[PDB]
């Protein structure tokens, strides 16, 4: 467990507070960018490199057949594992554009080719959703399950804007939790089903969801309706037997008061939970370890590295996981005149 300051050499004004790290095929890819794609990168995506503390950003390049993507803010990132047919996939859906709007489309991102000179090329295939599509929402979660043995994807949670009847120029910027119904989407074709469950009284937002062996455990769950941060941990167990996807659930006693967490995979299934926040005011500082197996998730607190006075005294803080028990975090920065690089960086490490 350790934290180290990193200095972003240059081009750090394009990182915004909500953004994503997709770790696939060696290098990790920054996604989500401040503003629209400057012709410095008409794509929008970056390869990130950490070297002697330096945070260096390179501009990725799409393939010819790929459709291009506008930068979602807080979408649901889903790692689709490497197998037939085209390994390996990232399911990105849905976020909010750099223009404050919600994008209810489904994008699939993969790796294509390298180098020549180490360069790595990506490609995005937009995937049609027939349905029963879920409405554009943000803060939700998407997860991949393998059930005897077909792979499917489960979509649940997240806020959205007021319905377009009550959408009011006085309630525009207000969000209300979209209703809590689980969407089962096939990777191919685009057939999306909607299920409802009784135990799910209300939808959530910002609750990290985990999936293994076609079962999903949901932590946190800041509900803005009752303003609670429920520490109950939820479980659902689904099985796809053609043609209905029968789905069941259970509530568990204990989960955790965390919203917006940074979950880094380290082992096969051992995770370190970095956490965003315990309370409205008071951010989360302790680090926890979350293993999970066929029994269930097994919880353990880890010694958090000693935070600098700066990072202990931050009003807000966010970040993400470079993966494999190492994570990257950013802090709003105050200065006069404004630096302007607003955000400071730590490299956190497990063991």
């Amino acid at each position: 467990m350790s934290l180290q300051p990193l200095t972003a050499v240059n081009c750090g004004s394009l990182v915004q507070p909500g953004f994503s790290l997709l770790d696939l095929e060696g290098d990790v890819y920054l996604f989500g960018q401040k503003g629209w794609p400057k012709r410095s990168c008409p794509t929008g995506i970056f390869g990130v490199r950490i070297k002697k503390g330096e945070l260096k950003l390179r501009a990725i390049s799409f393939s010819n057949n790929s459709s291009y993507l506008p930068p979602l803010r807080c979408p649901a990132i889903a790692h689709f594992e490497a197998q037939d047919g085209k390994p390996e996939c990232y399911l990105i859906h849905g976020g909010r554009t750099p223009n404050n709007e919600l994008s209810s489309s489904l994008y699939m991102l993969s790796v294509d080719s390298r180098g020549c000179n180490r360069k790595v090329t990506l490609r995005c295939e937009e995937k049609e959703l027939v349905g029963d599509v879920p409405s554009a929402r943000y803060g939700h979660t998407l997860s991949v399950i393998n059930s005897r043995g077909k792979t499917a994807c489960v979509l649940f949670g997240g806020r959205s804007y007021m319905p377009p009847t009550e959408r009011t120029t006085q309630n525009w910027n207000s969000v209300v939790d979209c209703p809590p119904q689980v969407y089962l989407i096939d990777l191919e074709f685009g057939c999306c089903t909607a299920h409802t469950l009784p135990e799910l009284t209300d939808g959530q937002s910002f609750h990290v969801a985990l999936a293994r062996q076609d079962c999903v455990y949901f932590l946190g769950g800041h509900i803005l309706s009752s303003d609670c941060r429920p520490s109950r941990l939820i479980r659902l167990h689904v099985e796809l037997l053609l043609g209905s996807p029968v789905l069941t659930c259970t509530i568990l006693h204990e989960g955790l008061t965390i919203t917006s967490a940074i979950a880094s995979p380290i082992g096969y299934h051992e995770y370190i939970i970095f956490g965003g926040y315990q309370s409205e005011t008071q951010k989360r500082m302790e680090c926890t370890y979350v293993g999970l197996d066929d029994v269930g998730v097994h919880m353990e607190s880890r010694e958090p590295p000693q935070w600098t006075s700066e990072i202990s005294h931050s009003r807000t803080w966010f970040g993400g996981s470079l993966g494999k028990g190492t994570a990257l975090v950013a802090i709003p920065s105050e200065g006069n005149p404004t630096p302007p690089e607003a955000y400071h960086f730590y490299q956190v490490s497990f063991q």
Binding site: W36, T43, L69
Partner: protein, 232 residues
């Protein structure tokens, strides 16, 4: 409020009743919203200015009914977004800025194609085609490479969020031609068409004799930046 004209009862057109005598004045410019925000972050600007766009778009259809002159009466509206600068005009329309290859907001000629042919052109740009061409850029139905997807849409990258009349701004045009003639005068004092590659030293040096010449003749001290009256 630019003009008010009349339509009832038919056959004819709009009969103007009122046309603003001094539209360029400040005293006739009505503020609606103030923010402590920068123009740059698109995120915060659209978050705030969204409800406004929906109202404009939602007001275009209906008819107003107001007690005026003693009677309830009905109005219709035509909005003309023209008071934007080009930085924001191009920002607000998905276009790339500002030394881009596609220079013109109205026509499709590149920089090269704008030094070759100066005059023969036709107005093309508007809102809706920009929307559809953004579609062409996002869906990518023809599986084209970046530079050529760039070429099929002719500079349409980001999604327009707002409609602005495709119009030119007067005042900044005067400033641009004035900075160009100022830069040209700096070059001509010295020999630029004799020596095609000067350094910065002669540029500041040429600027110094111009400024001295401007003060002795016409009585105008230099400005860090040429405001409109100095351009007059």
């Amino acid at each position: 409020i630019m003009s008010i004209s009349i339509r009832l009862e038919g056959e004819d057109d709009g009969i103007t009743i009122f046309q603003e005598q001094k539209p360029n004045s400040e005293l006739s410019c009505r503020p609606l919203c103030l923010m402590f925000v920068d123009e740059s972050d698109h995120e915060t600007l659209t978050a705030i200015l969204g409800p406004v766009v929906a109202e404009r778009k939602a007001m275009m259809e209906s008819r107003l009914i107001i007690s005026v002159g003693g009677l309830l009466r009905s109005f219709r509206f035509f909005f003309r977004g023209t008071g934007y600068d080009e930085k924001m005009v191009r920002e607000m329309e998905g276009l790339e800025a500002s030394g881009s290859t596609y220079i013109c907001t109205l026509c499709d000629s590149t920089r090269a194609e704008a030094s070759q042919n100066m005059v023969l052109h036709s107005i093309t740009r508007s809102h809706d085609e920009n929307l559809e061409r953004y579609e062409i850029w996002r869906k990518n139905p023809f599986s084209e490479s970046a530079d050529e997807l760039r070429d099929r849409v002719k500079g349409v990258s980001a999604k327009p969020f707002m409609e602005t009349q495709p119009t030119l701004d007067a005042l900044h045009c005067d400033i641009g031609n004035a900075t160009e003639f100022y830069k040209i005068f700096q070059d001509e004092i010295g020999e630029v068409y004799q020596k095609p590659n000067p350094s910065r030293e002669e540029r500041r040096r040429w600027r110094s004799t111009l400024d001295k010449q401007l003060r002795k003749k016409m009585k105008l001290k230099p400005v860090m930046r040429m405001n409109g009256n100095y351009a007059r």
